[PDB]
Ligand binder design. Structure first.
Ligand code: CL
Ligand code: CL
Ligand code: FE2
Ligand code: FE2
Lengths: 497, 497
């Protein structure tokens, strides 16, 4: 077997990216300022965090074992519980005390045969009294929201029709449905998309098999009252490349950014229309809705080049680190149209942005508030000379949050400071009566001065001001997605506006 | 109630002294070099680590909640398990989410009435399949060696005769007895010492009540084949001072360092002889033994002034921080003598030293190896300019270990480096055949460059060289005592030489 390193090496595990790999509890976190005493619930987030040094040099950030953080808030007090998802990979590597899973989404490089290759490291959502730890190459792993115990790989009472479950399911606040899909839904390199939904009682509702024009990465999707929308990142899979030890994903400069539209209910696979947006990178969906004329307004991060630059084209052509900006785009789609090519999108702000969140009380409907990460290169905002030598590599950088009011066009920007960066934020309704986008925003900060993490609590009345700064004495490595589960929501999801 | 602060303030909780307060697991610790594959067992250490900010300003380091670290070694792999002792204080404060216990050893300052005031934060020893978490004002807390679960306050099957159990019991390697005492054994300010022992079957053997000439701190003691020896630190307790909110302990410049000698077996309290050593501070006992003439050779750290300078005399007179040195002293005692005053001791090395360990296979008998902490002010050994601003306050500093061979007089010094400090070391016999003092030394390092802890593994054949450096990604706050439990020892203690 290729030897197992006994300590982490390489930029992807240097400085703030160095794995900590702790599981357990820190109760009564230190607080500067005051956590509003009416906040009650849990902020769950997932980070990739390799449990053992990889035998793959410069293993991408997306290949690290999913470690779940819960921040449990009550009466202005907050406790941290932290635990790794017990994936097949985690358990067998813990047993062997060495890495066994090889390259990102390439089973031909594994040192043993895995049934499930999930790192469960992308998103952590609440569904019918369980957490679901998501990774788009796999079914979910079900976990206990209170103890973070892993129950096991989850197949929805044997109803899961797909080998894959997206990291970005949508929760319809009116129907209480979880709207899902998986791509490569029949295995490596398949063009099968399985679109499926679950009613609030846990019974499968929709199941539609459709076919992607290419085997492309469908990381996120969008749901409106009557449609589901599949934006394809022009990263393309060739299993023959994988069998020779090559990358699962390879950029294709020659294809459009496909945007598939399928009727939400009662459709067959052949009903999908593959619209062709100008070539670019499909970033995260803020939200989509039908306007009065029944046109789909799809609002999402959109870049003009390969954000995942470590997977370039067949000739190694691609951007450098920190070169590609993504912009908050509005695409207009008409399912009735037979024109496949789409206009350039309009842009809602100028900021280099990503990780958009809305008030999920209006998910699939007209939203007028978006909270998102921004990366501002304007001199002074980030002390790059101090931060970059401490930052390591492999993870995106965000040096603020912005709140866009879509009606007034007003933008508020939160800047944690010149030696801090942010993760993805969550939005918390002030209470069950609160107006759209009124309440609290929380975001995890990397503090490069202390080499510690902090959890910032902001009031939407003034995003520029920290109401509380929760001071962790450890690092939480830069992570991916997270969700708020309010104690007042019995099913874990907020009530429709 | 006096308000509970929501974050740590004061020098005692700044820099490397900032509480982390994590409980749980970090498995498969990063290793630079190679842990000898034949090492099998667990290094247990305890640190004071306040779980909640004190309402007492500049609460001394000795008043922090005991947090137990276990380093579990097998086949060159090591895992950390970390858990707080569930003392009455820990449990009630966790319930209230605020500090309730007041000043060090002063119940008159507590915000509620405690039955047991233990922080269980001084030593962690193995006895008949349990850990005992020790604090000299209390009975032990019994814990599970594998899970670090707290069973509860331990009374040895109802046999414990004393309110108090020393942090420094001695394990007789020939008789397999645990030799114990407690001072203030009948409550605050009592001069009662209870000397007691347990046979390897768990049955109490000795129980002798005697009387201290003053109510003085008896932190450590010594055991030989035929004697037990009680060195009294000239810190003296007045309950009337405590009732007004004053300190439990106050230096008395006017008394000798009393050294009581009692026959080990069959004695009455009146059989104690209170020898009078020159005024000074009784530091930790390395070991004591009888020579051929049956005279006690007592080897211990000894200073000429108050090491615990934060508890000065009645007029606030005493040393400044970093002023008092302790030296490795040999006192000679003859139980037969009626001369109470004792000569100045001889000194075995010149180093400012403390935390002496021997090969416990010769405990209570002639030893010829001692391992100890040194503090060397020789320019360059510690980069004080870098370390002091990052160190916080309240804890002693050690910038190396020394191995003294008592036969050859050879000293080897381990220097972890200019920006690292050490805790108390443990000694591990190479195997059950190994000569006295032959095997491995482990010591926890504070790395002020990384603000991380490391666990150094040294071979006694060359103490200057790290065979392995285990790299923790978190801080373990400076702690007190620790012990090795070898997997090859059925009762957790090594076999006699
Ligand atoms: Cl589990
Ligand atoms: Cl417990
Ligand atoms: Fe994502
Ligand atoms: Fe001690």
């Amino acid at each position: 077997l290729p030897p197992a390193p006994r300590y982490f090496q390489g930029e992807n595990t240097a400085g703030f990216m160095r794995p900590v790999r702790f599981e357990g509890d820190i109760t009564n976190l230190e607080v500067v300022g005051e956590i509003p005493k009416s906040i009650e619930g849990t902020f769950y987030r997932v980070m990739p965090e390799p449990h053992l040094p990889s035998f793959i040099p410069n293993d991408p950030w997306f290949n690290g074992d999913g470690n779940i953080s819960g921040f449990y808030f009550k009466d202005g007090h907050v406790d941290l519980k932290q635990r790794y998802v017990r994936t097949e990979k985690f358990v067998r590597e813990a047993e062997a005390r060495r890495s066994l899973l090889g390259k990102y989404r390439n089973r031909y490089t594994d040192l043993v045969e895995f049934k499930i290759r999930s790192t469960a490291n992308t998103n952590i959502v609440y569904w019918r009294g369980q957490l679901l730890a998501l990774k788009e190459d796999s079914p979910p792993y079900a976990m206990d929201p209170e103890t973070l115990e892993t129950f096991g790989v989850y197949d929805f009472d044997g109803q899961l029709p797909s080998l894959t479950f997206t990291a970005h399911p949508k929760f319809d606040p009116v129907t209480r449905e979880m709207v899902c899909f998986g791509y490569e839904a029949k295995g490596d390199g398949t063009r099968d998309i399985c679109y499926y939904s679950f009613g609030p009682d846990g019974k499968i509702a929709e199941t539609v098999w459709l076919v992607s024009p290419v085997c492309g990465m469908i990381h996120d999707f969008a749901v409106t009252e009557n449609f589901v929308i599949f934006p394809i990142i022009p990263l393309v899979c060739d299993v023959e490349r994988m069998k020779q030890g090559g990358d699962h994903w390879q950029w294709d400069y020659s294809i459009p950014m496909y945007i598939g539209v399928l009727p939400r209910r009662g459709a067959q696979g052949s009903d999908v229309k593959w619209f062709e947006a100008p070539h670019g990178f499909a970033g995260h969906v803020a939200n989509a809705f039908e306007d009065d004329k029944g046109h789909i307004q799809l609002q999402m991060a959109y870049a003009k080049d390969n954000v995942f630059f470590w997977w370039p084209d067949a000739n190694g052509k691609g951007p450098r680190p920190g070169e590609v900006e993504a912009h908050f785009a509005n695409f207009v789609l008409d399912y009735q149209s037979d024109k496949l090519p789409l206009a350039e999108p309009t842009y809602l702000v100028d900021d280099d942005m990503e990780f958009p969140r809305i008030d999920d009380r209006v998910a699939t409907r007209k939203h007028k508030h978006t909270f998102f990460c921004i990366f501002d290169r304007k001199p002074g905002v980030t002390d790059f000379e101090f931060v970059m030598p401490r930052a390591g590599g492999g993870a995106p950088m965000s040096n603020g949050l912005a709140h866009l009011n879509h009606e007034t066009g007003d933008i508020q920007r939160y800047l944690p400071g010149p030696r801090k960066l942010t993760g993805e934020c969550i939005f918390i309704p002030r209470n069950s009566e609160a107006a759209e986008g009124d309440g609290y925003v929380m975001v995890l900060l990397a503090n490069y001065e202390d080499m510690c993490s902090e959890l910032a609590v902001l009031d939407t009345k003034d995003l520029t001001n920290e109401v509380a700064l929760i001071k962790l004495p450890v690092r939480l490595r830069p992570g991916l997605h997270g969700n708020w589960v309010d104690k007042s929501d019995v099913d874990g999801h907020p009530a429709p506006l």
